[PDB]
RNA sequence: GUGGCCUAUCGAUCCUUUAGUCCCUCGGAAUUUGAGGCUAGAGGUGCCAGAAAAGUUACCACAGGGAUAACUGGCUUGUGG
RNA sequence: UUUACUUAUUCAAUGAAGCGGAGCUGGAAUUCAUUUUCCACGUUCUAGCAUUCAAGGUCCCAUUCGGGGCUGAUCCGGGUU
RNA sequence: GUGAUUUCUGCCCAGUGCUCUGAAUGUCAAAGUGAAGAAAUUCAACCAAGCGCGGGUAAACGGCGGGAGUACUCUCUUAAGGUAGCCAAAUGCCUCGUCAUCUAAUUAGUGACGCGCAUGAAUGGAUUAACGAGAUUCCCACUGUCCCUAUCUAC
RNA sequence: CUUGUGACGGCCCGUGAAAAUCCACAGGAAGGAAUAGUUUUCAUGCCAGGUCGUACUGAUAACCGCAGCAGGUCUCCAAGG
RNA sequence: GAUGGGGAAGCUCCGUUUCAAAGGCCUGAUUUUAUGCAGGCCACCAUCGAAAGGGAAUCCGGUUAAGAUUCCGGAACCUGG
RNA sequence: UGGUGAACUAUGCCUGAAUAGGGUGAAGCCAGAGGAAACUCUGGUGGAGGCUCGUAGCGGUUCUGACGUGCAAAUCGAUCGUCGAAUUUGGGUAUAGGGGCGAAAGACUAAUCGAACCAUCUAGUAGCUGGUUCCUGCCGAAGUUUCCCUCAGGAUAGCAG
RNA sequence: UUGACCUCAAAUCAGGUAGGAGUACCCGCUGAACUUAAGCAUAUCAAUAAGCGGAGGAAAAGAAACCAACCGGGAUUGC
């Protein structure tokens, strides 16, 4: 369902515009915080040990 | 001044005489009669307007051909002399 | 509730565009045979003012190749075109301002205007005054060109689409303040009936979603869903963000 | 001894469901599922003899009411004087 | 289950005029035997002009007043693009 | 949406909306698939969008407190706690607020003050020349508005 | 003074109708003279011009306001101090 | 606002040049002759919509109880043939 | 439910028409002066502006004047706002009722608007108000019980014939 | 070249036919609400009123893909 929309409206696009639009829409911060949450998931186990 | 001074501005007819009924009900801009419906092929009549149907029905005029049909039927549509 | 003003605009009773003093649709010359196998030369007879349009128009005269007569096309005038200039339209036309080359035959960094979307609709893109399209790249296999639009978007259109080389004349218009409700009146008087604009928050609740209240305020949020229906879409439709960014 | 020492401690129709009879019916004739009946309970209406239910109107409307408020008058005189 | 095809369906233009394939004629081209290909394939100092089934060439007619065919203007498929 | 110019537009995305090209079994229709049954049928798996999870957004709707400690800091609530400005203002209940001025005398006016019931920044804040059949106060001129009434003309 | 017009100038993010109709130019189809023509965009001469409206008021009495209503209702001309 | 078309159970709706085989124009040729056959030209594409827009052409004098740029006398002009 | 209205008025379009006399004095330009130059000053010219005083015109602030069974179902008088434009207006034309149009008052849409008018459904319903037509004779009450979205009403018992 | 066939046209071609009215009754489509439920939404009003199409002296239906379960009846319509 997501892959249909990218073919519909984001077929003709380049990576500079892609990075600009996701930075302007704020999803990149969400991806960063998800990977960060994985980092403290590992880190808390390390501090326990 | 929506009353008496506004009634002085009224000098442009919305309706004029109609060709089928002679009623002064023919709208000038709509090009349609509001009583008989000219120039539509059917004549305007409504079952809620039963008194208007009584006003414009058959028998309220001359019946220039239909007066004699019963008499010709009674004689059997004979020909000759 | 009543039917609101933007809901009423689509019937086109009093909201049609005032087109009495307009000189014709400003389209490109049709892509017959000469324009796709060679070129053709026409003449600029006069540059004229179009009612309700910020840009001037150019009346270009060509010869009909199949019949002894003259054809008169209405182009949107590019900045620098003069009367008596020869205009060259075609595949083999030289790269000068005013010429009507197809987009496959112009190099990188070319600035064009009155660009066709698909080959043959006779001008769709960059037609308002001061606007232009920049060619960003070519793609010969699967023959397309990337272009930068006046909105900043990047489109990928066919390389057989045509465009007039240069920028649309009459640029810099909106930099002058109107200063007067009379000037705005005379501006929209030849476009359409969309002026003056009453705020919906100053209405009664029968007339607008924003109307009503003992103080002039909106009530709910003014950002409206894209899935909203007619009569609800009054405000900022499908806003990704709001506010003044710094 | 047919619940709580006595005086309070609780619930119709329709629908669903359970128990009993394993009985009656499915109407051209049978068998088996399914469904419908009979007798006795349960699921609940606290507005508790038991409608399924948010506001606003200073833009307002109708039928009425002195059975009913917002003056005066009348009785009263706490309060006031 | 992943990719292409066109005739259904859909969009657009034109007074449905130059579509596709092949061939000439030039240029590049390296040919490893003879041509593999690829580009072209009448117009750019100038606010003139461009029309009479087209002049010329050629073959007929029955010469005369002219008339017709081919070429000029390459073939093939009738898919308007 | 706000409403010339000038000068600025502080903090908050927890809520309600709006918006993502994120991540993907939690919710999860019809059709389709599988099992059981003699079949009606029952039961499961799978399961699109949207919800749910994760971000953004206040010139979007809006909000801009407490309690301690000691102007300051730390805690709660609920995200952040009213910044720049302004004020008994058309917004201040108490209130005829307090001080000054204006007058013989002022619940009026103006200038200040501010724990402001309940001021405040495009819900726009502050300022502002010119303009106003807008609202309010004072002064000069002027007068039957008044002391206090009288007289004349036409109808 | 009223009015017509000419040449100008200012203004605009406003640059301020369309068609019937008439004329000219380019072009050279065709027709053409010598005992004769060719021309009726030169002059004169001949015939016909159908249909419907046509009076009057246009307002403190002819229109609209229940009316002979101090109301309303478009426009042209405009003497002397 | 018809037609070609396309919707609508339908009264009817859309659309006005649209996915239409959409017509008439002059020269003449023939002088059984009527107007076909010799030809050649052209593709708008119904129609309605202004007594203030555009637009062929008339003035003076006289005349009635009541009409006049309309009648009478004189003097012009335009269109069609 | 089905029809009729933009002759008033709201708005857009098309085509026409109308608008004394003054005041202020914008760009552009000319002459003189000064300056070393940038440029400044003085005197003219010119005639700009959704400028201003004020007629016709358009409107309607106050007297809370007149009138208020009127001249008038909105008028009259004085005082006023505005008066070259976002001006005023004729005719043609477009938009029609949960619809139009609105510089926004729920305003206007034929003296009708917080949903026009006409006819029909329709003799709509009303526990509510009003009325209900001759005489005499005999008998003769109740405002209490129980239940009801019951409290201005019913059912039921009682009282009465 | 000529003659067929198929399909599609044009004629002020030869001859015809349809429209509109009426509409009490008839055959269909479409389709409410007032009202009742002592409120009201399913229901009711009502497969009605209004609207639209189409006939006749009647129309429609009609000679069983019927009713039955009996010792079986026998097109339709109406009481
Ligand atoms: Mg407007
Ligand atoms: Mg509001
Ligand atoms: Zn008629």
From Swiss-Prot, chain B:
<dbReference type="InterPro" id="IPR001569">
    <property type="entry name" value="Ribosomal_eL37"/>
</dbReference>
<keyword id="KW-0694">RNA-binding</keyword>
<dbReference type="GO" id="GO:0003735">
    <property type="term" value="F:structural constituent of ribosome"/>
</dbReference>
<dbReference type="GO" id="GO:0003723">
    <property type="term" value="F:RNA binding"/>
</dbReference>
<feature type="binding site">
    <location>
        <position position="21"/>
    </location>
    <ligand>
        <name>Zn(2+)</name>
    </ligand>
</feature>
<keyword id="KW-0963">Cytoplasm</keyword>
<keyword id="KW-0863">Zinc-finger</keyword>
<dbReference type="GO" id="GO:0030687">
    <property type="term" value="C:preribosome, large subunit precursor"/>
</dbReference>
<dbReference type="GO" id="GO:0019843">
    <property type="term" value="F:rRNA binding"/>
</dbReference>
<dbReference type="GO" id="GO:0005829">
    <property type="term" value="C:cytosol"/>
</dbReference>
<feature type="binding site">
    <location>
        <position position="33"/>
    </location>
    <ligand>
        <name>Zn(2+)</name>
    </ligand>
</feature>
<keyword id="KW-0699">rRNA-binding</keyword>
<feature type="binding site">
    <location>
        <position position="36"/>
    </location>
    <ligand>
        <name>Zn(2+)</name>
    </ligand>
</feature>
<feature type="zinc finger region" description="C4-type">
    <location>
        <begin position="18"/>
        <end position="36"/>
    </location>
</feature>
<dbReference type="InterPro" id="IPR011332">
    <property type="entry name" value="Ribosomal_zn-bd"/>
</dbReference>
<dbReference type="GO" id="GO:0002181">
    <property type="term" value="P:cytoplasmic translation"/>
</dbReference>
<keyword id="KW-0479">Metal-binding</keyword>
<dbReference type="GO" id="GO:0008270">
    <property type="term" value="F:zinc ion binding"/>
</dbReference>
<comment type="subunit">
    <text>Component of the large ribosomal subunit (LSU). Mature yeast ribosomes consist of a small (40S) and a large (60S) subunit. The 40S small subunit contains 1 molecule of ribosomal RNA (18S rRNA) and 33 different proteins (encoded by 57 genes). The large 60S subunit contains 3 rRNA molecules (25S, 5.8S and 5S rRNA) and 46 different proteins (encoded by 81 genes).</text>
</comment>
<dbReference type="GO" id="GO:0000448">
    <property type="term" value="P:cleavage in ITS2 between 5.8S rRNA and LSU-rRNA of tricistronic rRNA transcript (SSU-rRNA, 5.8S rRNA, LSU-rRNA)"/>
</dbReference>
<keyword id="KW-0689">Ribosomal protein</keyword>
<comment type="similarity">
    <text>Belongs to the eukaryotic ribosomal protein eL37 family.</text>
</comment>
From Swiss-Prot, chain C:
<feature type="modified residue" description="Phosphoserine">
    <location>
        <position position="94"/>
    </location>
</feature>
<dbReference type="GO" id="GO:0022625">
    <property type="term" value="C:cytosolic large ribosomal subunit"/>
</dbReference>
<feature type="cross-link" description="Glycyl lysine isopeptide (Lys-Gly) (interchain with G-Cter in ubiquitin)">
    <location>
        <position position="144"/>
    </location>
</feature>
<keyword id="KW-0963">Cytoplasm</keyword>
<keyword id="KW-1017">Isopeptide bond</keyword>
<keyword id="KW-0597">Phosphoprotein</keyword>
<dbReference type="InterPro" id="IPR022666">
    <property type="entry name" value="Ribosomal_uL2_RNA-bd_dom"/>
</dbReference>
<comment type="similarity">
    <text>Belongs to the universal ribosomal protein uL2 family.</text>
</comment>
<feature type="modified residue" description="Phosphoserine">
    <location>
        <position position="159"/>
    </location>
</feature>
<dbReference type="GO" id="GO:0003723">
    <property type="term" value="F:RNA binding"/>
</dbReference>
<dbReference type="GO" id="GO:0002181">
    <property type="term" value="P:cytoplasmic translation"/>
</dbReference>
<dbReference type="InterPro" id="IPR022669">
    <property type="entry name" value="Ribosomal_uL2_C"/>
</dbReference>
<dbReference type="GO" id="GO:0005829">
    <property type="term" value="C:cytosol"/>
</dbReference>
<comment type="function">
    <text>Component of the ribosome, a large ribonucleoprotein complex responsible for the synthesis of proteins in the cell. The small ribosomal subunit (SSU) binds messenger RNAs (mRNAs) and translates the encoded message by selecting cognate aminoacyl-transfer RNA (tRNA) molecules. The large subunit (LSU) contains the ribosomal catalytic site termed the peptidyl transferase center (PTC), which catalyzes the formation of peptide bonds, thereby polymerizing the amino acids delivered by tRNAs into a polypeptide chain.</text>
</comment>
<dbReference type="InterPro" id="IPR014722">
    <property type="entry name" value="Rib_uL2_dom2"/>
</dbReference>
<feature type="modified residue" description="Phosphoserine">
    <location>
        <position position="51"/>
    </location>
</feature>
<dbReference type="GO" id="GO:0003735">
    <property type="term" value="F:structural constituent of ribosome"/>
</dbReference>
<dbReference type="GO" id="GO:1990145">
    <property type="term" value="P:maintenance of translational fidelity"/>
</dbReference>
<dbReference type="InterPro" id="IPR002171">
    <property type="entry name" value="Ribosomal_uL2"/>
</dbReference>
<dbReference type="InterPro" id="IPR022671">
    <property type="entry name" value="Ribosomal_uL2_CS"/>
</dbReference>
<feature type="modified residue" description="Phosphoserine">
    <location>
        <position position="158"/>
    </location>
</feature>
<keyword id="KW-0687">Ribonucleoprotein</keyword>
